[PDB]
Ligand binder design. Sequence first.
Ligand SMILES: C=C(/C=C\C[C@@H](O)[C@@H](O)[C@H](O)C/C=C/C=C\[C@@H](O)C[C@@H]1O[C@H](C[C@@H](O)[C@H](O)C[C@H]2O[C@H]([C@H](O)[C@H](O)CC[C@H](O)/C=C/[C@H](C)[C@@H](O)C[C@]3(O)O[C@H](C[C@@H](O)CCCCCCC[C@@]45C[C@@H](C)C[C@@](C)(O4)[C@@H](C[C@@H](C)CCCCC[C@@H](O)[C@H](O)[C@H](O)[C@@H](O)[C@H](O)[C@H]4O[C@H](C[C@H](O)[C@H](O)/C(C)=C/[C@H](O)C[C@@H](C)[C@H](O)C(=O)N/C=C/C(=O)NCCCO)[C@H](O)[C@@H](O)[C@@H]4O)O5)[C@H](O)[C@@H](O)[C@H]3O)C[C@@H](O)[C@@H]2O)[C@@H](O)[C@H](O)[C@H]1O)CC[C@H](O)[C@@H](O)[C@H](O)[C@H](C)C[C@H]1O[C@H](/C=C\[C@@H](O)[C@H](O)C[C@@H]2C[C@@H]3C[C@H](O2)[C@@H](CC[C@H]2O[C@H](CN)C[C@H]2O)O3)[C@@H](O)[C@H](O)[C@H]1O
Ligand SMILES: CCCCCCCC/C=C\CCCCCCCC(=O)OC[C@H](COP(=O)(O)OCC[N+](C)(C)C)OC(=O)CCCCCCC/C=C\CCCCCCCC
Ligand SMILES: CCCCCCCC/C=C\CCCCCCCC(=O)OC[C@H](COP(=O)(O)OCC[N+](C)(C)C)OC(=O)CCCCCCC/C=C\CCCCCCCC
Ligand SMILES: CCCCCCCC/C=C\CCCCCCCC(=O)OC[C@H](COP(=O)(O)OCC[N+](C)(C)C)OC(=O)CCCCCCC/C=C\CCCCCCCC
Ligand SMILES: CCCCCCCC/C=C\CCCCCCCC(=O)OC[C@H](COP(=O)(O)OCC[N+](C)(C)C)OC(=O)CCCCCCC/C=C\CCCCCCCC
Ligand SMILES: CCCCCCCC/C=C\CCCCCCCC(=O)OC[C@H](COP(=O)(O)OCC[N+](C)(C)C)OC(=O)CCCCCCC/C=C\CCCCCCCC
Ligand SMILES: CCCCCCCC/C=C\CCCCCCCC(=O)OC[C@H](COP(=O)(O)OCC[N+](C)(C)C)OC(=O)CCCCCCC/C=C\CCCCCCCC
Ligand SMILES: Nc1ncnc2c1ncn2[C@@H]1O[C@H](COP(=O)(O)OP(=O)(O)OP(=O)(O)O)[C@@H](O)[C@H]1O
Ligand SMILES: CC(C)CCC[C@@H](C)[C@H]1CC[C@H]2[C@@H]3CC=C4C[C@@H](O)CC[C@]4(C)[C@H]3CC[C@]12C
Ligand SMILES: CC(C)CCC[C@@H](C)[C@H]1CC[C@H]2[C@@H]3CC=C4C[C@@H](O)CC[C@]4(C)[C@H]3CC[C@]12C
Ligand SMILES: CC(C)CCC[C@@H](C)[C@H]1CC[C@H]2[C@@H]3CC=C4C[C@@H](O)CC[C@]4(C)[C@H]3CC[C@]12C
Ligand SMILES: [Mg+2]
Ligand code: NA
Ligand code: NA
Ligand code: NA
Ligand code: NA
Length: 979
Amino acid sequence: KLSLDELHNKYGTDLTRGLTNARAKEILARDGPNSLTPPPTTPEWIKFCRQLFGGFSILLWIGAILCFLAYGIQAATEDEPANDNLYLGVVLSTVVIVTGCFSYYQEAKSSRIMDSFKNMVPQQALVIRDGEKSTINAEFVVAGDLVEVKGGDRIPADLRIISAHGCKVDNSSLTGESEPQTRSPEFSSENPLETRNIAFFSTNCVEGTARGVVVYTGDRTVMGRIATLASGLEVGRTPIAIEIEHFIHIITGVAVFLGVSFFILSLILGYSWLEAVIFLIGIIVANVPEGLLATVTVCLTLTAKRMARKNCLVKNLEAVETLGSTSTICSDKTGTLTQNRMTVAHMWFDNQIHEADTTENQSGAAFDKTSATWSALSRIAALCNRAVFQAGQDNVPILKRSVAGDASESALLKCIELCCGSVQGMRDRNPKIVEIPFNSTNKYQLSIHENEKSSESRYLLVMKGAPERILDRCSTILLNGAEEPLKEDMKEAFQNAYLELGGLGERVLGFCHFALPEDKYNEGYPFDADEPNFPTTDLCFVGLMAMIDPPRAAVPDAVGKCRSAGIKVIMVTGDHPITAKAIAKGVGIISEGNETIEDIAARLNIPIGQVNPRDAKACVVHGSDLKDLSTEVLDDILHYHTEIVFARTSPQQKLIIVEGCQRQGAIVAVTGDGVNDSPALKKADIGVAMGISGSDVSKQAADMILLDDNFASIVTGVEEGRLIFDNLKKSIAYTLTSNIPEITPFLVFIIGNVPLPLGTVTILCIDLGTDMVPAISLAYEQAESDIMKRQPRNPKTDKLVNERLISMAYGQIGMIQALGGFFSYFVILAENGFLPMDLIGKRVRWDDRWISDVEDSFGQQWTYEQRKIVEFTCHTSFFISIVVVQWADLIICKTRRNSIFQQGMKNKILIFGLFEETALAAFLSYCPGTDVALRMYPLKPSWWFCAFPYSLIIFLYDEMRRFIIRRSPGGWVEQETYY
Ligand SMILES: C=C(/C=C\C[C@@H](O)[C@@H](O)[C@H](O)C/C=C/C=C\[C@@H](O)C[C@@H]1O[C@H](C[C@@H](O)[C@H](O)C[C@H]2O[C@H]([C@H](O)[C@H](O)CC[C@H](O)/C=C/[C@H](C)[C@@H](O)C[C@]3(O)O[C@H](C[C@@H](O)CCCCCCC[C@@]45C[C@@H](C)C[C@@](C)(O4)[C@@H](C[C@@H](C)CCCCC[C@@H](O)[C@H](O)[C@H](O)[C@@H](O)[C@H](O)[C@H]4O[C@H](C[C@H](O)[C@H](O)/C(C)=C/[C@H](O)C[C@@H](C)[C@H](O)C(=O)N/C=C/C(=O)NCCCO)[C@H](O)[C@@H](O)[C@@H]4O)O5)[C@H](O)[C@@H](O)[C@H]3O)C[C@@H](O)[C@@H]2O)[C@@H](O)[C@H](O)[C@H]1O)CC[C@H](O)[C@@H](O)[C@H](O)[C@H](C)C[C@H]1O[C@H](/C=C\[C@@H](O)[C@H](O)C[C@@H]2C[C@@H]3C[C@H](O2)[C@@H](CC[C@H]2O[C@H](CN)C[C@H]2O)O3)[C@@H](O)[C@H](O)[C@H]1O
Ligand SMILES: CCCCCCCC/C=C\CCCCCCCC(=O)OC[C@H](COP(=O)(O)OCC[N+](C)(C)C)OC(=O)CCCCCCC/C=C\CCCCCCCC
Ligand SMILES: CCCCCCCC/C=C\CCCCCCCC(=O)OC[C@H](COP(=O)(O)OCC[N+](C)(C)C)OC(=O)CCCCCCC/C=C\CCCCCCCC
Ligand SMILES: CCCCCCCC/C=C\CCCCCCCC(=O)OC[C@H](COP(=O)(O)OCC[N+](C)(C)C)OC(=O)CCCCCCC/C=C\CCCCCCCC
Ligand SMILES: CCCCCCCC/C=C\CCCCCCCC(=O)OC[C@H](COP(=O)(O)OCC[N+](C)(C)C)OC(=O)CCCCCCC/C=C\CCCCCCCC
Ligand SMILES: CCCCCCCC/C=C\CCCCCCCC(=O)OC[C@H](COP(=O)(O)OCC[N+](C)(C)C)OC(=O)CCCCCCC/C=C\CCCCCCCC
Ligand SMILES: CCCCCCCC/C=C\CCCCCCCC(=O)OC[C@H](COP(=O)(O)OCC[N+](C)(C)C)OC(=O)CCCCCCC/C=C\CCCCCCCC
Ligand SMILES: Nc1ncnc2c1ncn2[C@@H]1O[C@H](COP(=O)(O)OP(=O)(O)OP(=O)(O)O)[C@@H](O)[C@H]1O
Ligand SMILES: CC(C)CCC[C@@H](C)[C@H]1CC[C@H]2[C@@H]3CC=C4C[C@@H](O)CC[C@]4(C)[C@H]3CC[C@]12C
Ligand SMILES: CC(C)CCC[C@@H](C)[C@H]1CC[C@H]2[C@@H]3CC=C4C[C@@H](O)CC[C@]4(C)[C@H]3CC[C@]12C
Ligand SMILES: CC(C)CCC[C@@H](C)[C@H]1CC[C@H]2[C@@H]3CC=C4C[C@@H](O)CC[C@]4(C)[C@H]3CC[C@]12C
Ligand SMILES: [Mg+2]
Ligand code: NA
Ligand code: NA
Ligand code: NA
Ligand code: NA
């Protein structure tokens, strides 16, 4: 409740010149940037407690505790004790600590990449300083400067409206109601939230333009004070995640059951009540997989970094998964398909077609520049146009300089300045009184100006737009200079002219004008843009103007890839069905051979109505018919046609098409740029907002932001989206196989009563060696050729972890790695004197420190450490046999449909893993001192080869398993083993 003078006198500001740059910076440094502050959080404290002290590591923490107590009772009691317990504790503790460090290096990394994407797409407001308009980052606006807003932009700070032009804002986020409240410079209510002279933070200007003085800036804003609570906010969990968990739950159920079962087997066999609970605890801990979620989050984050390098920024992680399943892409033409760098080609007037483009000069012998009709046409183009040359281009040529405005007005302005002269004087010769702006719903631009004729003080009215709309507003035609009527002979010549200019892939516009009678509209009467002050019809059409705009380079290949993938492409354009049909013919939407109902009517020379609608694979629907049509007809066209093109479609219409595409049971992505589009961008599954030309509304309302505004970028993004899935399945498959060889020894040991084949140290060596680096390498795998030559996926029918993965890992591959390790075990014992038949039952006697007289097969007598040494040599051999079989498992994990001879060994990280693991096994087995500390003993040369036959069998089996898949689709192998 103040005035414009009181406001400018309180903060200090020129209503018509704004602030000065020096003063603006003085205030900018005086009170801090216009950006909210970060909220409270937990430091490394709660970050490390969850890592080193979580749920699975807790048990290891116990193992360490127990062992230390085992050493204390020893050193305190027994003279000259042993040290296997002290080193066991020193090893276990180091394992919990490392696992924690690795996990930390991953959790932080993801939390940082996400923060990087937030500054990729910052926000920039329009401020007026020293009398000039400039677009600066929202973080540089201060209190006092002048700020201008336009329908589609966001209010930067708390403004005080000083001048508005039918400006409306969406005040729904703050108080909650989306009806657009109009912002007027006058004051209306005592409550600041109800008055119209104040713009607010985070609001959006729906329609209109306005000016205002920044009253409040930074955290000193309404939503800033309210943010105390907003801080907490809310997040979510992607599908894939709730898929992995679910799995974990089932496995836990299976594990708890088996625990109780192994319990009854133990007591029916005579163990100690305590030994049965010890077994239950160990078995349930060994059946539940560990790591799944960490690898899913890391893989997703890394893939997102890969996608941002290829131009696709995602507002969240759920978009990374939905992009792969994409079935339909509803894209626009001017901005996505074409280049928006248009240029005029053919003009129509005096019932004649005229060419242009006088090579940046006055040559080319286009047409007599003297033509009267041409003077009128050149004048309306130069007058109704709203674009202007960018300041300081007095040096560059007429075609290569920079302009500000629509691409249509830019092409028009350049043609008129090259062969018609300076527009600023042409614009001052006639003074502009009232102008009405373009719009997609109107489809025309009009304005009235004074007439520079010193003998005629009347008013001139000019308007341009889609040739059909303008034709409906004319009853005369400027012909050869005079006026004539629009009868059917020239009406048909005009129709054939539209197809002539349209077939050339050029855009076409209509231009008309009319002399307003100064007797009914005097020189003093003001024609406010509210009611019908100008005769819409009865105008004088002067002539058409056409311009070219070509497609992108990579576009043809993109549509071809979509056709091979089993993806439908639809062109939704606001242009004509011809120009549409043409662009479609070029990009590849409408391939050769397919015809429409009109094509068949033309070939057969039969009425279009007689032709059978099912006979045509492709079609083109118009806007008027779409307005009239119902739901069943729409489903008919969407289901029966393969290539559908939509012309003269308004923005509000789009939602119906999207709802029809989803009714079928398909995932859709829509590209948007304006304000009317926003509703659609929310209903679809993937909202692609333009980054270059988009508005704050389109970006806030969408899931993804295209950084370059290219259609070819999308298809590449979907390729990146499918690769994530393929690699995730491969990695999980490689991790789950090692479970079988680690559990089978503890089973035969208890049931069969034989010496323990695998221990604690060796098992820890397996988990950390063959499952960490090779698994990580799998993520980096390349894409198999087939990636784009395969149908999309149905999330309901195809899941990540299904009953087939467990079939390949546990059942087929696993059992083989187990047999491979058992062979090395049997061989080591047989050679040292203990044969296989004599081994069944020796455990009871084997594990007794007191029987130094143990007798072997050849009759020798063994002490306690002499036999324990051979057992440890078996632990080391088992370990190596596991690394050897892992070689094969890893190689076969690279591809699931192609062979490795086809895919190739170009992955470097995977190779690194093979060499490094082999090195770890050789090092631990041969190093001089591991004996005392880790309990591993040297392996003789003839033993390393025991696992080789089992390693080759796995590779050959998978190779054939794949050949049968490639040859017989939908067969038994694909139904059963294709995971
Ligand atoms: C950290 C862990 C925890 C521990 C770790 C541990 O290892 C180590 O840290 C150590 O602790 C280190 C700690 C050290 C601490 C301190 C030390 O430093 C210091 C030194 O320690 C030394 C000790 C140390 O030297 C020791 O030796 C260490 C070992 O300890 C364990 C030993 O064995 C054993 O404990 C020895 C100790 C002693 O023996 C204890 C005895 C009992 C307590 C108790 O009985 C004695 C006594 O009686 O207790 C009394 C107290 C009472 O209140 C208690 C009440 C009793 C309740 C009764 C109810 C029973 C119950 C319960 C019901 C639920 C069900 C039910 C059926 O039974 C039901 C039925 C009722 C109706 C029964 C009623 C019975 C009545 C009984 C009671 O009344 C009492 O007995 C009674 O009151 C008594 O007073 C009385 O005397 C009674 O006597 C008799 C009773 C009978 O005896 C008794 O009842 C009997 C027999 C029952 C029998 O079952 C009957 C049967 C026959 C049956 O019925 C039968 O006939 N069947 C006939 C069948 C038949 O015909 N069939 C014919 C078929 C025809 O068709 C009599 O009968 C009764 O009448 C009479 O009343 O109710 C009281 O105090 C006294 O009385 C006392 O004497 C073993 C270990 O713990 C340890 O090694 C000390 O000597 C020394 O002085 C000290 O200085 C977690 C573990 C790990 O998770 C796991 O890995 C684990 O490590 C492995 C499993 C190890 C195994 O493998 C190792 C090698 C490698 C492994 O590590 C590998 O890692 C394995 C892994 C595992 C998994 C899988 C796989 O492999 C790998 C895969 C993983 C991979 O995948 C991953 C992915 N996630 C990644 C990767 O990791 O992980 C091996 O080395 C291990 O050896 C091996 O085990
Ligand atoms: C829980 C999941 C486990 C997964 C794999 C577990 C691996 C376990 C494999 C073996 C463990 C059992 C212990 C074997 C000891 C049995 C000894 C035996 O058997 O002594 C019989 C013969 C020895 O004859 P001799 O020359 O000394 O007699 C000479 C006679 N004179 C001279 C008078 C003419 O030994 C033979 O013939 C060959 C016997 C060697 C071992 C055969 C064991 C059974 C056969 C295949 C097992 C693999 C099954 C795979 C199943 C996959 C799904 C689970
Ligand atoms: C010290 C440690 C040494 C370790 C040595 C390991 C040796 C390897 C072990 C076994 C190898 C044999 C496995 C054969 C399995 C069948 C593979 C198969 O059927 O692949 C089919 C592919 C055809 O694919 P496509 O036409 O669909 O591609 C289309 C590509 N697009 C789409 C671009 C046109 O064929 C191809 O890629 C052509 C590839 C041909 C490779 C032939 C290898 C066989 C030669 C000797 C094998 C060893 C025999 C016994 C050895 C005992 C050794 C002591
Ligand atoms: C005693 C008996 C033991 C039996 C045990 C069995 C063990 C496992 C059995 C087999 C595993 C090894 C199989 C190796 C496969 C080689 C395949 C190959 O050669 O496919 C030729 C490729 C294709 O080329 P392209 O241009 O047509 O691809 C175009 C790709 N597109 C179309 C995407 C552009 O060429 C390339 O990949 C580029 C050249 C890559 C050369 C890789 C050489 C390294 C191979 C293995 C490393 C050793 C690891 C073991 C470490 C322990 C050692 C102590
Ligand atoms: C990637 C992760 C996967 C695997 C992770 C495994 C985690 C394990 C972490 C730590 C384990 C520490 C093991 C400590 C090594 C032994 C220390 C020790 O307690 O030794 C005690 C022995 C004394 O025995 P004694 O007197 O009873 O013998 C009597 C012999 N009689 C009587 C027959 C003559 O000391 C001796 O023998 C003297 C020999 C000293 C041995 C020097 C070897 C250096 C050890 C590690 C350095 C290697 C790091 C790798 C760097 C790679 C660079 C590229
Ligand atoms: C481009 C870069 C490629 C890199 C590939 C991997 C690099 C491989 C690195 C090293 C491998 C060579 C190892 C040579 C070691 C010989 C040392 C030796 O003196 O050893 C003697 C033993 C005999 O022991 P004994 O029990 O009779 O006497 C015991 C007598 N006492 C115990 C009383 C003393 O003999 C043995 O260990 C035999 C040793 C094994 C013989 C090698 C057979 C493999 C040959 C080629 C396969 C290479 C894979 C490439 C595949 C490419 C596919 C595209
Ligand atoms: C140390 C040893 C190292 C090497 C060991 C090598 C072991 C690997 C050897 C073979 C791999 C076994 C793979 C098992 C898959 C067989 C499954 C099968 O039965 O699938 C039959 C399919 C039928 O498909 P469908 O759609 O008509 O079914 C329609 C079904 N309904 C009517 C119900 C809808 O395909 C057909 O019938 C036609 C295709 C038949 C393919 C036969 C492939 C034989 C290839 C190699 C075996 C020879 C190895 C020789 C080595 C000598 C070693 C001493
Ligand atoms: N400044 C303008 N004034 C008047 N008419 C214009 C102007 N710019 C373009 N036109 C024409 O008005 C009509 C409205 O087109 P509109 O902007 O709705 O869609 P479009 O150019 O086909 O683009 P897109 O498919 O990207 O939405 C078109 O025939 C266009 O050529
Ligand atoms: C699920 C996990 C964490 C439970 C771990 C249980 C541990 C603490 C239990 C399991 C078996 C127990 C041992 C069983 C037998 C004996 C022998 C006795 O003379 C001293 C105690 C001692 C050595 C016990 C100590 C505690 C012990 C090691
Ligand atoms: C350690 C040993 C004794 C365990 C042996 C486990 C074997 C028998 C288990 C491991 C994985 C299992 C398979 C897992 C999935 C399926 C798919 C289902 O539609 C039919 C059963 C089938 C094919 C299972 C059969 C039993 C199976 C092969
Ligand atoms: C392709 C297929 C059929 C070849 C199978 C070859 C079999 C018979 C070969 C492969 C590796 C070989 C083993 C390699 C090393 C040793 C250690 C030695 O001290 C005793 C023999 C023994 C245990 C061999 C026995 C024969 C063996 C198992
Ligand atoms: Mg558009
Ligand atoms: Na693990
Ligand atoms: Na959405
Ligand atoms: Na594996
Ligand atoms: Na594992």
